[PDB]
Design a protein around this nucleic acid. Structure first.
Ligand SMILES: [Mg+2]
Ligand SMILES: [Mg+2]
Ligand SMILES: [Mg+2]
Ligand SMILES: [Mg+2]
Ligand SMILES: [Mg+2]
Ligand SMILES: [Mg+2]
Ligand SMILES: [Mg+2]
Ligand SMILES: [Mg+2]
Ligand SMILES: [Mg+2]
Ligand SMILES: [Mg+2]
Ligand SMILES: [Mg+2]
Ligand SMILES: [Mg+2]
Ligand SMILES: [Mg+2]
Ligand SMILES: [Mg+2]
Ligand SMILES: [Mg+2]
Ligand SMILES: [Mg+2]
Ligand SMILES: [Mg+2]
Ligand SMILES: [Mg+2]
Ligand SMILES: [Mg+2]
Ligand SMILES: [Mg+2]
Ligand SMILES: [Mg+2]
Ligand SMILES: [Mg+2]
Ligand SMILES: [Mg+2]
Ligand SMILES: [Mg+2]
Ligand SMILES: [Mg+2]
Ligand SMILES: [Mg+2]
Ligand SMILES: [Mg+2]
Ligand SMILES: [Mg+2]
Ligand SMILES: [Mg+2]
Ligand SMILES: [Mg+2]
Ligand SMILES: [Mg+2]
Ligand SMILES: [Mg+2]
Ligand SMILES: [Mg+2]
Ligand SMILES: [Mg+2]
Ligand SMILES: [Mg+2]
Ligand SMILES: [Mg+2]
Ligand SMILES: [Mg+2]
Ligand SMILES: [Mg+2]
Ligand SMILES: [Mg+2]
Ligand SMILES: [Mg+2]
Lengths: 75, 50, 96, 77, 64
RNA sequence: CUUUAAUGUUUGAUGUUCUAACGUUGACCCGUAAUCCGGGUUGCGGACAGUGUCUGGUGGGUAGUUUGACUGGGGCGGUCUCCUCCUAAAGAGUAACGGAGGAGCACGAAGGUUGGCUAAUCCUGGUCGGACAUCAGGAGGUUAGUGCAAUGGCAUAAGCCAGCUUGACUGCGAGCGUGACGGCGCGAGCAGGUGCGAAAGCAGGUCAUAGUGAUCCGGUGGUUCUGAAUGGAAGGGCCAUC
RNA sequence: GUUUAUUAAAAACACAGCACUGUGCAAACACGAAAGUGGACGUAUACGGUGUGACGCCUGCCCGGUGCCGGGAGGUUAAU
RNA sequence: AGGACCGAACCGACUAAUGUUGAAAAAUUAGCGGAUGACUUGUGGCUGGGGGUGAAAGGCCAAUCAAACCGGGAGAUAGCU
RNA sequence: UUUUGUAUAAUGGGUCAGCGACUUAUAUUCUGUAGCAAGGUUAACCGAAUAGGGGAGCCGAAGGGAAACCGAGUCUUAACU
């Protein structure tokens, strides 16, 4: 899709190549937060005292839905 | 799946359409079939639309 | 209409139709009601004065649902095809 | 251990009207999957190989054919 | 007090000339492309409420 | 008409000033024998502050509530709808956290019809060529093939080629099958218009069985069926569809 | 020194001492639908919140995350 | 001089026995800690229920406290006995 | 009483006497009986007031269709064997 960035071209160059970078950092925040909720789920799952709390974040992983990354046509 | 929905709108001027599915990735061109139009009670051409 | 949790019958099925306000001011007339009104003129003002139709009725209609014997003259109504022949066979007259 | 526990609803196949039975027109005689019973005289064949009557009469099973295949026919008796 | 008719059931059932009720066939509202024309065509006319659930409708419609 | 300057002309933005709204929990006088309150004089801020309606943000400070079932106790793991075989005791059906596998599609041809055709695997002979390509004979017989898992089927081929095509069509439907119902399935034949074939005829999708979700709410198109005094219209209804 | 009156008196709470942070006074903060009160007839050597807890030697690296503070150029953005 | 020392009144409650339909709905007996201080006590006031007060135990608020007592909604609802 | 099952070591009851749990109102449907019968019946109210007036109105004798509309037919369909 087309996005309108005011600025001439080199004030554009920052935003277009920064909004991509901030998306990859945000996308990698969830992918590192999911992998730390899987530390709890994979450890205290069969435990009787911590099962009700591990299945509280075993169903919290299913609500993050990291946004997809498309490839630039500028190859 | 990859097969989406289209409608073949008649050419007899009346509003009548047969709805079918068509894969667009293999063939991006329109569909032309002579079908039956109950409004005018004749076999006419049905060009794809939507 | 409660079946333990599954979808009740009055909700499995879809709603249909619409209620027409013109049907509540239209009334049929049995062919035997013409011998009960007056000295031989049938209209809205005489049918509803002999308690054959309601007060708010405007479009009556005479069907073949009885046996006419007196020569009545239907003034303004919507007699059917079958009830028309029976009325004229007794000497009646139908107009507008 | 586990990884099983699946099945499908029974399709209720088999012969419905056995030999010597008086059937009407269009009444299903046998529901099959392949063609176990072949259509003979006065019976048809559905798209799913269902055999149905085409004229009222008495069902008859016979083994006509070079390959000794079961056939179903109808006698208009 | 007067019995209150179930307003939801009154919008889906109509009473015929011998006490039976007529209703509209389901499965004819959306995604009508998967369905064959023969399957659609047989769902168009109104049908009659079956014997098994004829007592569930009379309770919901005491006046109609 | 274009572009332009000057006056006025109505308005917006910013910046300095001003007192007159407003504030004063600065000072003095009176009600008054009263560190409350009101009035008066004055000084300082001054259209800022603050309050009312509307609005964007933040808001476990606070309030209402939710947080599935089966289960060889409960939790974890597994499962929840559909298709194929066995258990299923030679009609139909039949359970377990019993034993094994699949589906959430595909195709404008991979559908219809007319014409034609028949495989796997082996032996022998033959340039590259080889255990195994392509070819010529013989044995064999469907041990091959089927868009997709398994079962049943298929030579009149439902498997393999080519020509023409859109019946993958509209309104119906005698009579049956299977479900507690919602529903699902098979169907000769009738009416109107097509396709293939000389014609008899075949054609209402595909060898069959999985490839799918009701109602409410709303979107698009057609249709006077209705249209809250009347003529319209908005909004409903019906048909097709998302 | 205080604490679970009535099964726990303790290593828990408090404490003097230390640090950060807020507050220029009609102070911040609290009880109040508001007027008003406490803070205080106190004025930053004062008052409130948080953590640690005499005294001695000390308190290392990390600002990416979440808070808080500052910036105003640019993007997005409500009522009107 | 001292939130100093030993120790009666006074304030508490660390150990054991008895008591447990008790003399007592937490006491008696023998020992025990503080006892000029952040002490103790008499009389009268103030703070009240999602509130008070709390050297902080969810403690105390009339033998009742993870939300007092009385009356009302009220014959709440109870797929449970 | 509850259960697949109780002498059950599963629940309840110390005994007597008195009290203690399917009712009332208005609607709808079915059966019995009584009245009238293609008709049946009033409500409020008036009334020297269990009489008599009151037929506003309700149910039934006609159905089909979403509806206009048609009518012993009607809907679907261009039309139905
Ligand atoms: Mg629709
Ligand atoms: Mg909460
Ligand atoms: Mg509630
Ligand atoms: Mg459970
Ligand atoms: Mg069997
Ligand atoms: Mg058997
Ligand atoms: Mg059984
Ligand atoms: Mg094929
Ligand atoms: Mg052929
Ligand atoms: Mg074929
Ligand atoms: Mg297939
Ligand atoms: Mg109008
Ligand atoms: Mg419309
Ligand atoms: Mg001590
Ligand atoms: Mg204690
Ligand atoms: Mg103690
Ligand atoms: Mg003060
Ligand atoms: Mg500490
Ligand atoms: Mg540190
Ligand atoms: Mg001392
Ligand atoms: Mg004490
Ligand atoms: Mg003592
Ligand atoms: Mg001491
Ligand atoms: Mg002492
Ligand atoms: Mg006192
Ligand atoms: Mg108490
Ligand atoms: Mg509470
Ligand atoms: Mg109540
Ligand atoms: Mg109660
Ligand atoms: Mg409850
Ligand atoms: Mg029993
Ligand atoms: Mg038991
Ligand atoms: Mg016994
Ligand atoms: Mg025993
Ligand atoms: Mg005993
Ligand atoms: Mg016992
Ligand atoms: Mg018990
Ligand atoms: Mg007992
Ligand atoms: Mg009694
Ligand atoms: Mg009618």
């Amino acid at each position: 899709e087309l996005r309108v960035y005011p600025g001439n071209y080199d004030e554009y160059m920052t935003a277009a190549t920064q909004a991509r970078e901030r998306l990859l950092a945000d996308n990698a925040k969830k992918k590192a937060q999911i992998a730390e909720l899987q530390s709890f789920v994979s450890r205290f799952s069969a435990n009787a005292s911590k099962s009700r709390q591990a299945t509280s974040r075993a169903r919290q992983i299913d609500k993050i839905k990291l946004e997809e990354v498309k490839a630039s046509s500028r190859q | 799946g990859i097969r989406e929905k289209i409608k073949l709108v008649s050419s007899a001027g009346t509003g009548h359409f047969y709805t079918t599915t068509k894969n667009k990735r293999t063939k991006p061109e329109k569909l032309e079939l002579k079908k039956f139009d109950p409004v005018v009670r004749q076999h006419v051409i049905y060009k794809e639309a939507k | 209409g409660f079946e333990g949790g599954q979808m009740p019958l009055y909700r499995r099925l879809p709603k249909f139709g619409f209620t027409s306000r013109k049907a509540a001011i239209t009334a049929e007339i049995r062919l035997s009601d013409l011998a009960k009104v007056e000295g031989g003129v049938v209209d809205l003002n005489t049918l509803k004065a002999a308690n054959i139709i309601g007060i708010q009725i405007e479009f009556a209609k005479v069907i073949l649902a009885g046996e006419v014997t007196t020569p009545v003259t239907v003034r303004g109504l919507r007699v059917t095809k079958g009830a028309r022949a029976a009325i004229e066979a007794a000497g009646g007259k139908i107009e507008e | 251990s586990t990884r099983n526990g699946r099945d499908s609803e029974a399709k209720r196949l088999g012969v419905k009207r056995f030999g010597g039975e008086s059937v009407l027109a269009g009444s299903i005689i046998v529901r099959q999957r392949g063609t176990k019973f072949h259509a003979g005289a006065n019976v048809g064949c559905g798209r799913d190989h269902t055999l149905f009557a085409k004229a009222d009469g008495k069902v008859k099973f016979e083994v006509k054919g070079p390959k000794n295949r079961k056939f179903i026919s109808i006698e208009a008796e | 007090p007067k019995i209150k008719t179930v307003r939801g059931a009154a919008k889906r059932f109509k009473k015929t000339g011998k006490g039976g009720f007529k209703h509209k066939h389901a499965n004819l509202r959306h995604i009508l492309t998967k369905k064959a024309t023969k399957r659609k065509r047989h769902l168009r006319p109104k049908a009659m409420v079956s014997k098994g659930d004829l007592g569930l409708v009379i309770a919901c419609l005491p006046y109609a």
